[PDB]
Write a protein that binds this ligand. Structure first.
Ligand SMILES: Cc1sc2c(c1C)C(c1ccc(Cl)cc1)=N[C@@H](CC(=O)OC(C)(C)C)c1[nH]nc(C)[n+]1-2
Length: 106
């Protein structure tokens, strides 16, 4: 709960306010984006609002488990999309920021 609080107040907050965060703020809306294959290819969907709601309602038992959700979020993007896709560049940049902030965790 020392570190979970970091991930809430610092990591999540900074990722959320970064301008690349917007595709990752809600779950993928497959109807609106017309991706009928998405939730078949991506079996463990994850997004920043889920991670937040999960912190807010104390779903996590350990910092490690919150970190793995962030990583699933990014790996989901890489699996569904292609190298050189705009969405993949955004995700890689958010991932860099993410590591940057992990380095400075308590
Ligand atoms: C709201 C969301 S959620 C999202 C995207 C959007 C737009 C984007 C996207 C975001 C930003 C830019 Cl510049 C380009 C695409 N892409 C899709 C995959 C796709 O192909 O969607 C289109 C068919 C392109 C809509 C995708 N995969 N994983 C995620 C989280 N997203």
């Amino acid at each position: 709960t020392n570190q979970l609080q970091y991930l809430q107040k610092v990591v999540l907050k900074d990722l959320w306010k970064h301008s690349f965060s917007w595709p990752f703020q809600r779950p993928v809306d497959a109807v609106k984006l017309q991706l009928p294959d998405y939730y078949t290819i991506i079996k463990n969907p994850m997004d920043l609002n889920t991670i937040k709601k999960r912190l807010e309602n104390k779903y996590y038992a350990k910092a490690s488990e919150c970190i793995e959700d962030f990583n699933t979020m990014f790996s989901n993007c890489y699996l569904y999309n292609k190298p050189g896709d705009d969405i993949v560049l955004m995700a890689q940049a958010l991932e860099k920021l993410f590591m940057q902030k992990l380095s400075q965790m308590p």
